[PDB]
Amino acid sequence: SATIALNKRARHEYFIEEEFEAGLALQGWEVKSLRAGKANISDSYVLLRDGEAFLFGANITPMAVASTHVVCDPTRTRKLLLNQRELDSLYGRVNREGYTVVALSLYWKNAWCKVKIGVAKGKKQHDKRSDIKEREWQVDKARIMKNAHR
RNA sequence: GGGCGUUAAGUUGCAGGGUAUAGACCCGAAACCCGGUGAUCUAGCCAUGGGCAGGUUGAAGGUUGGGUAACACUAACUGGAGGACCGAACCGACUAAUGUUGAAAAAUUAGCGGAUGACUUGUGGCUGGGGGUGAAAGGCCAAUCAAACCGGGAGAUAGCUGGUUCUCCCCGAAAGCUAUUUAGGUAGCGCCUCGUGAAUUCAUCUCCGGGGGUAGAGCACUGUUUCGGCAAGGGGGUCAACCCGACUUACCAACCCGAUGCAAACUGCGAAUACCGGAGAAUGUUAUCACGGGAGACACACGGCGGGUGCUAACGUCCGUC
RNA sequence: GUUUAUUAAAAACACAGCACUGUGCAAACACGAAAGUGGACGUAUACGGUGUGACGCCUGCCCGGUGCCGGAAGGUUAAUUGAUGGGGUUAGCGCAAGCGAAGCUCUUGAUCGAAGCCCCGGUAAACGGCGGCCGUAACUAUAACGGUCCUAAGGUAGCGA
RNA sequence: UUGAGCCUUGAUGUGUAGGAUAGGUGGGAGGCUUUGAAGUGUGGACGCCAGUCUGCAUGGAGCCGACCUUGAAAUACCACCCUUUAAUGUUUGAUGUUCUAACGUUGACCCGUAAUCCGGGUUGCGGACAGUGUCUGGUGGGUAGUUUGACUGGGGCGGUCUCCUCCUAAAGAGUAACGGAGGAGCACGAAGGUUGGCUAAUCCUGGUCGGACAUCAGGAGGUUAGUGCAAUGGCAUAAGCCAGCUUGACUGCGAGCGUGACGGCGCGAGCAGGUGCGAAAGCAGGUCAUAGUGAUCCGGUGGUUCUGAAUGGAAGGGCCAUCGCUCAACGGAUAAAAGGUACUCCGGGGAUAACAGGCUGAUACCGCCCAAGAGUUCAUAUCGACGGCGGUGUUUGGCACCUCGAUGUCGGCUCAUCACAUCCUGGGGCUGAAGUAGGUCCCAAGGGUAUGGCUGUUCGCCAUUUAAAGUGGUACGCGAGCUG
RNA sequence: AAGGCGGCCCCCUGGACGAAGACUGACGCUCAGGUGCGAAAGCGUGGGGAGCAAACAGGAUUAGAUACCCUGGUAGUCCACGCCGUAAACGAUGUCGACUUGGAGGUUGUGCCCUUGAGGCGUGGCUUCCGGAGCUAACGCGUUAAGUCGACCGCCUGGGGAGUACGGCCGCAAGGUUAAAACUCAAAUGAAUUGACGGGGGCCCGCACAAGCGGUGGAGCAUGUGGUUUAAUUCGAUGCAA
RNA sequence: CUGCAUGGCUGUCGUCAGCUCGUGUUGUGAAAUGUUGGGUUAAGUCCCGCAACGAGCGCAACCCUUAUCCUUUGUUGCCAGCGGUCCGGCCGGGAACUCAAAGGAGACUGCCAGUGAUAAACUGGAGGAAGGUGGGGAUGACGUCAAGUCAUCAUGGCCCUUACGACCAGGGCUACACACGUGCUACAAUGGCGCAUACAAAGAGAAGCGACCUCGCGAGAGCAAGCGGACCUCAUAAAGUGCGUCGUAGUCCGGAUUGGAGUCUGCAACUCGACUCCAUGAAGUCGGAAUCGCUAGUAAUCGUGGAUCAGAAUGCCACGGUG
RNA sequence: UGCCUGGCGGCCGUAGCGCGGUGGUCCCACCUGACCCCAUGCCGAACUCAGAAGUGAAACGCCGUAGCGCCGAUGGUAGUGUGGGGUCUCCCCAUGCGAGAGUAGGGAACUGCCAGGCAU
RNA sequence: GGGGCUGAUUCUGGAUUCGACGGGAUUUGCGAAACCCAAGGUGCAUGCCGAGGGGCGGUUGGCCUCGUAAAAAGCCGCAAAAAAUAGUCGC
C-alpha cells in the first residue's frame, strides 16, 4: 500500500496507547527521498519547546546533490502538523520523567506525508520479560487445554 | 458556353538520322544451373604382406624362506608389461642460417620430437562435390577449395574501367531546377544544332507610369543598454560606538520625463541598382517566338561584388550576378 | 598423440573418467523417391547424440523467459459433410410494370471435426540468470546490526589487478 | 451406449373480477349415453392448493351445459390442435468387446534349389491395426530463393525524409547548407450564409462580504485587445463580439489569369435550374488568407440514357457518386524481408577516409605592449593578475587539393646534415652580484653533448657519471641499408 | 567380552550351567608394544528407495526467528564389498582369587519327599530391590562392596590456553592417534545445609475472582500532584504503602 | 543541609500466622527434630501418631461498646393509680415502668441425637435476647522496604556570625495553552416544585451557645431572659408522608458562568471566605478500553452534630432515618 | 450677391489635439411623455413614434491662441550603377542618382453640389 | 565526447498538508503617533549655561533636577553566572 518506513523496534520497546496521525512539514529533497529515496524513521522522538514539536530523530538518504548552492544535511529537525485541539495533551502529559512521544510509522495520504506519533512510557528488561512470559503462557495454556480436551 | 475536329494530299520504293525486339560499338568479371571426369597427391575405411639397429628401468605372476589357525604381510631367485627412457632406419617439421627470377612453384645446412604402437609402409578396392572425408584447421578432395575439373546455357549481367582508326567547312553549350532505394545513373525542363513559318518580334539608348522596404537612417512598435530628475527606500553607518539612528554607507533600486547607442527574424521613414509595361529615333546577317529531327549535359573552379557557415582562417564549404 | 600439405604445432581437437537424454529390436539414428544396408549377425553392463575432460574437495539458489515431458477440465481451430437466407432462368399468372410453383445454377454458411495453440505442473551435469541505497560500536576508521524499493535469486564453496 | 422425422400431441391455460384449466374465424349445445358417463379412493403430480391430466384396484352407468364474478360463453361439441410435455418398432455417428477372409510377418516347415535373395504351399501371431495414395492444421535455417534505403564536409552512430510561417534571400519572381526560430497529419450543422446591433487590452477613483484578483458606477487610453491554433501579412465598412432566419458547406458549366518539366494546384467575372437572408440595392459555389495531406493498380457500396461474344436475360465491364493504404523512406519497387564475414572475392575512386605532402593557424611553443602588485620602502635584479598585439610551423585541430592500375606507416642499430628560440665551453650588461657559488638578458652554431633496470618503445621513473647528457625539421630521416 | 541382538522356518557355528563318573597334572592370572572386534554419524563403488528425515523451498509467531510449529523435500536411513575408529562406547566402578551378618524376589537346572494346587526341605549359575558391620567429604557402596587383602596394566598432579599448534603415524577425504610451550588468574571444583526463585507439583485462606449493587473514566463544579510562567508559586510525601 | 550517623514516632507485608529459645537426640561439620504427618480450625486452636520433652514472642481470653434480666438511688429524667384544672406532666403526688449509671446473673459445644479414630472436632435441635468468637472496637511478633520525617522535638559532625541570623510594608502559595488522583452536583416524571405533618441519636456552649418581640422577600439587625449546662439554647431533622402541578420536552431538568445592589465575622475579603435577592440558564440527556468497595442493619440514598476556627468542607471524624 | 446652419463628396497628419468664449431669428442637439408598432437577452442607456415649455448646460459649430502633434527647404552627410585604384575584414578618384534625422521656415485647412433661414 | 529513459503518484492542465507556523484583507476597544486641540484646575515652567549617572560606564542631553549649578534617575550594558536539555541505560 502507501506504507513507508515504520519503526517496529520502538513498537516492541513501548506499549503506546496514543495514536495521532499528524503530518510533517518538509523541504524539497525531503519529499523527493520520501517518495523514493529511503527516509528512515528509526530513533524518533519529539522536541516540544514552544509550539514547535520538531521530529528531532529522523534520517534520510538524499536523492542527489542537485541543490549545490546551499548544502543541506539529513539531520534536520522536521516540524509537525497537528491540531491545537490535541496539541494540549503534548503540552501536558509529556513531562513525567519517564514519558516520551515517539513516531511509529510514516505513510502517504493524497500526496501528503503523515507520520503517526504516540505517547509511551518505556519498558525496562524486567517487564519485557513478563510480557514475553505472558505471551508464551497464553499459547501454552491454550495448547494444554486442547491436549486435555482431545 | 467549354474540349476535339471541320482549311491541308496521301501512299509506295530508294538513301539517310533516330526508336523498339532481337547480343546490338568492342574487350573484362567475381557468380548460378545442367550433364559428365577424378580417392594414383591428400582425408577416412576395408583386405593382404613388410619395417622398428643397439643400450636401460624391474609390475602382475611363479617358486624358496619367515610369518598367519588360514589368510594378509615380509626376505631371496626367475619375470620382461608399459600408449615406459636414450638412441639408429623410418615418420614429422619446433629453432636459426642459406635462398626468395633459388639446386627446389616450401628445399638445404646445424640442432629437434616420436621411434613396440592412437606407429609407419607396399599393393588393390570403397566413400562424388551443396557432396565425400575430416583426433575439427573451414583443413584435404590430383601444385587450384567458405563449395574440385571439362563442356553447355553463354557473346549471362556489368548504372562500372579502358579503347573507338581518313579530311575540310559552318554553328556551338552545361556541370543548373524538378523527381528518383536517387546523389558518379536516368527522365522532363533550363542550355545547343538543323529545318519550316511568323508578327517592329528581340536587344541598346531617351522619355513616362507603378510596385518596393535592401543599403543608409531612426527608436513611433517589438527586444537590449548607459548616465540624470521624480521618487519607496534598503545594505557596514562617520556615529551612539546598547540608541530612535544624526545620516549616504566607492552598492542596488517600478512607472513617469530629458538625452546616448545596438538589431537578419524592429521599421513613424527611405535611395542607387534590379524588374514589368507604354511612346520614339539609330544600330544589330530575326539576333525573338512556335513546331518538328538530332544531341550533348545535371562532378565545375577562381576572381570582383552582398552574404550564411568557419576563427570576416584556408588554393575550405554553401547561395545570387558578371 | 593430432591439427591448418606451402608464414600460426599451441592454452587449439582427441583422450580414459563423469553426467544427461533417446533407444524392447522390424530399436533409435544415417545413407537411400524405394528395395536395401550400416548400427549388428550386437540386445539396456549394448548403441547413438549432447556437455566436461586423468586424479583429491564439490556442482550451492532460481522455471520470471525459450526449449523438453506429463494432462486434456475449459477457449480457438484445418481438411470433411452441407440447415437456411439471397440472386439468375422461366411453364404459368398478368389488357402493363410486376409476381412467378418444379428443374439447373452463383453466393453466405447451420452442425461434426483431430493435432496444434491458449492453460496447469515438473525439468538447469537444458538454453540461462544470480542488487544497488543509508544510518548505527568506549577518539579516528569500518560496519556485527537495522530500516526498505525490486527481483527468480541477488554469486554459496573456492580463487583473485 | 447411442441423433433428429417417426405408433400419440398422455397435452397445455387462468383480468385484483373468479363452481375459472374458457366455446379458434363460419356453426353459439351429446358426436357422449352398448364413439362403455359423476361413482369409493387419497402412487405421480401442473401447483397464484380456488384448484388441477386428477391417473388409476371391485362399479357395468351421467360429469357436465346454462355460466355464477360476467370487460371474454366451457375443451361435455364440428375443433389445418396452442404460453407446450412423453415411450417403443423407421433411420445409423462415435467410445468399446469378439472373429478372420483383406493386409503385414527381418516366427517355423517344405519346394523351385545345389541358394540366409525371391516366389509358391502348409502352419502360428497381429488384425481391420499398422502402412501406403490425395487434401489438410502444426512443427520445420535440415535445405533453397531473397531483403537489410538515401542525405552525410570519408563510413557507422547521432538527426532528417511530407506541408506551412519569419530571416539569411542582395527593395519584382525564384534562390542552398547537418543554418538560425516555431508549427501542421485538426476542429466546427456551427466556429458557415444573410440581416440588425455592438466596440477592447491596461490603469486610476468610489463601493457589503470581495482579497495584487470577479460582479458594479465614473474616468485616463485608443486596438498597446481579439483572430479555434505556430508565425507572417491584414481586419473599424470591421475579418473582432452578440441576436433573428436558414443550409450556397447547392448542381452543370465557365471568358480570363497565376504557379509548376510534368502529374498537378489555386483565383475567378459571368450563364442555366432551384434556394437562404435582406423592404430593397445586394450577398452566399464554406470558415481573414497561407499547414490539416497520398498518384496508380486492385477491389466494396447505390444509380445508370450503356456494353450483354447465336437469341432473351443474367454474370462481368464501362459511366456517375463514394469507400478500403503513420504506402510518414510521404511522386508511393512487392500484398509479403533482419545481420556477420579478420575465410572473402569482382568492377571501380584519391569523385572518398586512415600514415604522409599542401593550404590556414583555433589550439601548441615563443616574443613583445600598458601596469594592480609580490619583492623589508622600491614595477621592472626576478616575476606579474585584469587585457592586447605578433612570429614559427612545432603538438592537438579544419579542407579533401597529388597519390587506392600501390607513396610500407611505430620503435630499435648504423649513418648525418641544417636551423639558433644555446646545455656546456667563449665574450659582455644588470643584479635584491661582498667572495665561492647564483637569477635574468644580448652576441656567438667552432666543437662536444651518457651508461644500465622497467615496458615493443617514442615519453617517463629510478641508480651512477659528466660541462651537458639542449629543442626542432629532414615522407613525425633513413626496411631497393637490417630485424619485427 | 563390549558394541549389540525381537515374526516364523531351514543350514553351519560360538558361548554358558547342572546331576554322577575317570585322567592331564600348575599346563595358572595380568599385560607395555602388537593384532582383532567395535553404536551411530561419515566416505568409495554397484543397486535399491515405501515411510521418516539433515541441506533446501513456502506458510506462520515474534521488533528481528537463517529455530521451535505447519506443507513439501535431497543426501542419509536399506542391500553387498570396501574406508575412519569416534560416543555420556556409563555401573562415569580395568581382569582374577578367597575371606565378611540378612530379608524380599526374577530367570534357569538338579536330589528327595503321599507332587491331592505354581506341596516342602537342600544345592548350583545369572540378575533386581532393601539393609547390618565396615568404607566414603557426603551422596551413597554394602557377598555382583565403593568392607579387609593379594598379582598385573593404564591414568591423575590448579582452572583457562587445549586434548590446541608443531612434529611422527593412520586415513581418498572428513578426521583420528602421540602431544606441548609462551601468557593470565586467584581460584576453578563435587556432596550436603538454610533461604529465595520456577512459565514445577500438592493443599489452604482473604470481596481475589465467579453471582450481584452502586459508582469512577463523560461536562462544568471543591481539592492535591507533575510541567509550564513569574521574584516567589516556600519545603517535605513521589508505586501498592504519594 | 546530612532520616545513606541517629533517638523518638509512623506506614507496608498483616490481625497473615507464623517467628524463636532451654535441654535432649541425630549428622565430624553448615544444620535437622521439636515447628513435619492424620483429622480439625477463624487460626503453631486441640487431639492422635512420632526423639522428643517444655517454654517465650505469637492466636484466643482478660480490656471498651451493644444485644436480656435482677438489685441498689429517682432530678434537670417517667406518668401504672388518684384530684383538680388554664387540658398543658400543669403539680400535688406516685418510685413499677422509658431512662439515668454502679454491681451482678446471663452463651460456657453447656446438653440431646447423628457423624469420627472408643478422641479432637463437625451437623442438626429442647431451652434462651442470644450458638459456636452472639455483633463491632482497641490490642499489629520475630523482621523486610538505607521505607517517611534532622521543617513537631532532641541529637554527632559540616556550614554564617556586618549574615543561611534579627524587625516591618506589599505580593505568592488560590497562577494564562494541559494531564493525573480522590469527592460533590447531577442525567430527571423513583423526580424538583407550592402549601399542612411525624419519626432519632450523639456532641458544643462563658469576652460562648444564644430564647422571645419588632423590622425584615434575606443572610441578619435593636431588644435581649435562661445557660459552666438531663433545666436553656445550637436544633419544627430530611428521606417520607397528604393534595394538586409539571407528561418525556433548549423540560417547572442541571445552578456552572456572568451583571446589579447588600447582609454577618475580621485594623482590612481586588489579588483571596461564606451566606441573601433579582436575572442570566455552560454542559448534560447514563459515559470507550480498563477499573473501585461492599456478604447484613453491611452497599446505596437522606439529614445532623463535633475537631482546629474572628470567618471559611463538596474534606476529616461520629451519630442516626430508610434500607 | 455676402452671414452663418444642414446634407453629399473631393482632398484624408500644414486636414489632428490642448487653452480662451461666443452662436438660437433659422437648422441640430438637449428634452416632454409614451396604451399604440417597435425596443431592452433589466431599465425609452440606443431605434422609434406623438411635440416644441425651456436651454445652448453637455454636445455640434465658429473665431484667436506656437503649448503639442505635423509639413518640412538650401547646404552638408551616409549609400551606390559604371570605369579606374590603395595600405583591401575596409577605404580613394572621375561620374550621375543623391537619402533619414536635425536647422531656417510654414501652419490654427481649402474646395463641389443642392436644401432652407438671413440683409439685399 | 555525443544519443535514449527518469526528474509524474501522476502521466488525464485545476491536491484547501484538516492541523501549528509567515502573510493578506472584513467585523471590535483606544494611547498626540490609531487621533486633531489650551481650558476646567489656576502653578511658578517652555527654553535659555545644564552635573555625569544604580555596584560600574553610557542614549538624541534632557526622560531627574534646580536657582544661577550638583547629587545625577525614569532605560541600556556588568548583569540570571536555573542554558545545560526525550526513552532505555553500570558500580
Ligand SMILES: [Mg+2]
Ligand atoms: Mg554471374
Ligand SMILES: [Mg+2]
Ligand atoms: Mg544466389
Ligand SMILES: [Mg+2]
Ligand atoms: Mg614408447
Ligand SMILES: [Mg+2]
Ligand atoms: Mg617421451
Ligand SMILES: [Mg+2]
Ligand atoms: Mg634436418
Ligand SMILES: [Mg+2]
Ligand atoms: Mg632424430
Ligand SMILES: [Mg+2]
Ligand atoms: Mg626416443
Ligand SMILES: [Mg+2]
Ligand atoms: Mg575396400
Ligand SMILES: [Mg+2]
Ligand atoms: Mg569445416
Ligand SMILES: [Mg+2]
Ligand atoms: Mg575461423
Ligand SMILES: [Mg+2]
Ligand atoms: Mg560445388
Ligand SMILES: [Mg+2]
Ligand atoms: Mg554455389
Ligand SMILES: [Mg+2]
Ligand atoms: Mg541465356
Ligand SMILES: [Mg+2]
Ligand atoms: Mg562476357
Ligand SMILES: [Mg+2]
Ligand atoms: Mg563562333
Ligand SMILES: [Mg+2]
Ligand atoms: Mg553511379
